[PDB]
């Protein structure tokens, strides 16, 4: 299993590598600079945030996480296990999200997932353990690795927007080939695909 690649501290090297693909050379120059992501000091809390916010507006997502933070002991595994399913519903969580949050907390206290020690674990091992939680599939696990843990080399082949972008920009090409070239910077490449979609949604000119 590939060794864990550290988060980027700057994007200069990444953009030069990606810019070897003339499609990304254009996309990166049209979209400009993207902020450098810092790996979270609290993977558990960031997982709960992600789960809680799913399908909600940005303001609603922040609000509900704020209500979780307000429960006794906050967004900490042992504390969350002492809150009733009824009081978790009470903060506004769907039953599906209650079950996911309880399952994640339970996995933390039982040692099934060691959220304090993810940094040494290869992407696929972290993914496999997250996937075993109800309501967390591969896509959610991969989004977590990319955005929460700031891992540099994640291409989520289940992300509709990424796949549509590759289809659009590289018609007739094998996506596995296209995206392999971007390694070891598939996460930044993905973020530039999402940025390009947002650019097009704002009225931008196509490639
Ligand atoms: Cl909800
Ligand atoms: Cl998922």
CA 148 remoteness from chain centre: 6
Contact assessment for residue 67 and residue 89, using Cβ atoms and an 8 Å cutoff: no
* Cβ–Cβ < 8 Å for 167, 150: no
Statement to judge: residues 49 and 143 lie in one domain: yes
CB 23 within 8 A of CB 31: no
Same domain? 32 vs 132? no
Domain that holds residue 182: 1-39+152-207
Q: Based on the fold, state whether residues 26 and 49 are members of the same structural domain.
A: no
Claim to verify: residue 131 and residue 159 sit in the same structural domain? no
Which residues crowd ion ligand 2, with CB under 5 Å? 137, 139-140
- Strands, DSSP E only, in the chain? none
Task: Say yes or no: 1 and 12 in one domain.
Answer: yes
CATH of the domain at 27: 1.10.1670.40
Distance 63 CA to ligand 1 centre (A): 11
Same-domain status, 53 and 30:
no
Same domain, 146 and 45: yes
Domain identity same for 65 and 123: yes
Domain shared by 26 and 68, yes or no: no
How far is ligand 1, taken at its centre, from the CA of residue 80, in Å?
17
Q: Which of 129, 151, 173 is the last residue of a domain?
A: 151
Transcribe 92-103 into DSSP letters: T--HHHHHHHHH
Method of determination is X-ray
Quick one: which ligand is closest to 138's CA?
2
Last residue of a domain, one of 151, 170, 191: 151
How much distance in Å is there from the Cα of 113 to the middle of ligand 2? Answer: 18
What is the token pair recorded at 18? 């990606």
Cα of 146 from ligand 1 centre, angstroms: 23
35-57 burial code (b ≥16 CB/10 A, e <16): eebeebeebbbbbbbbbbbeebe
**Domain count along the chain:** 2
The CA 165 to ligand 1 mean position distance, Å, reads 29
How many angstroms is it from 163 CA to the middle of ligand 2?
15
22 plus 47 within the same structural domain: no
Resolution reading in Å: 2.0
Instruction: Compute, in angstroms, the gap from residue 51 CA to the centroid of ligand 2.
Output: 10
Q: Give the separation between CA 62 and CA 92, rounded to whole angstroms.
A: 12
State whether 161 and 143 are in the same domain. no
Could you tell me the distance, in angstroms and rounded to a whole number, from the CA of residue 76 to the centre of ligand 1? 19
Using CA atoms, how far apart are residues 194 and 38, in angstroms rounded to an integer? 19
DSSP state of 91: T
One domain, residues 59 and 95 = yes
Check which CATH number belongs to the domain holding 134 and give it.
1.10.340.30
Residue ending a domain, among 151, 179, 199, is 151
Ligand nearest to the CA of 54: 1
């Amino acid at each position: 299993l590939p060794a864990v690649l550290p988060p980027l501290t700057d994007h200069a090297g990444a953009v030069a590598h990606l810019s070897r693909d003339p499609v990304l050379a254009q996309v990166t120059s049209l979209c400009g600079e993207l902020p450098v992501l810092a790996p979270t000091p609290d993977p558990f809390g960031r997982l709960v945030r992600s789960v809680a916010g799913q399908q909600l507006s940005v303001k609603a997502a922040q609000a509900i996480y704020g209500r979780l933070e307000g429960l006794p002991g906050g967004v900490v595994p042992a504390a969350l296990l002492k809150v009733s399913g009824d009081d978790l519903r009470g903060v506004g969580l769907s039953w599906a999200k209650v079950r996911t949050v309880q399952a994640a907390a339970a996995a933390a206290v039982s040692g099934q997932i060691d959220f304090a020690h993810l940094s040494g674990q290869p992407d696929e091992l972290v993914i496999a353990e997250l996937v075993q939680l109800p309501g967390i599939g591969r896509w959610t696990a991969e989004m977590f690795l990319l955005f929460a843990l700031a891992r540099p080399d994640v291409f989520s082949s289940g992300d509709l927007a990424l796949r549509q972008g590759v289809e659009r920009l590289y018609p007739g090409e094998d996506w596995r080939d296209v995206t392999a070239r971007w390694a070891p910077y598939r996460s930044l490449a993905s973020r530039y695909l999402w940025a390009n979609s947002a650019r097009m949604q704002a009225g931008g000119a196509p490639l």
